Amino acid sequence: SCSGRDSRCPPVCCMGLMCSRGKCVSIYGE
Secondary structure, three states: OOEOOOOOOOOOEOOOEOOOOOOOOEOOOO
8 A cells, every 4th residue: 555645654655645744745746
């Protein structure tokens, strides 16, 4: 599995997601 949008991260997030201080967010946008 992986941390999809809003999940605890990083480097836990899914491919394309990073972490807005603790919630996955699309690297593309931010």
